[PDB]
Amino acid sequence: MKKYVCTVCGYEYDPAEGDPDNGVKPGTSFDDLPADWVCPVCGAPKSEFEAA
Numbered sequence: 913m914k915k916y917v918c919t920v921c922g923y924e925y926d927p928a929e930g931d932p933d934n935g936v937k938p939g940t941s942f943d944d945l946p947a948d949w950v951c952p953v954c955g956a957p958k959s960e961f962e963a964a
């Protein structure tokens with residue numbers, strides 16, 4: 913359930929919510945995001961998220 917924050921824009925990935933519009937169901941951990949997933953607010957890579 914660990915949240916991660918985008919260091920570009922401040923969006924928080926919340927595993928309890930997932931990211932349905934990008935094919936990520938509620939409950940999906942950050943580490944299990946698809947390899948091509950990017951921040952939905954700004955487009956930044958996962959490599960620029962940090963644990964929040």
Ligand SMILES: [Fe+2]
Pocket residue numbers: 918919920921922923951952953954955956
């Ligand atoms: Fe972002």
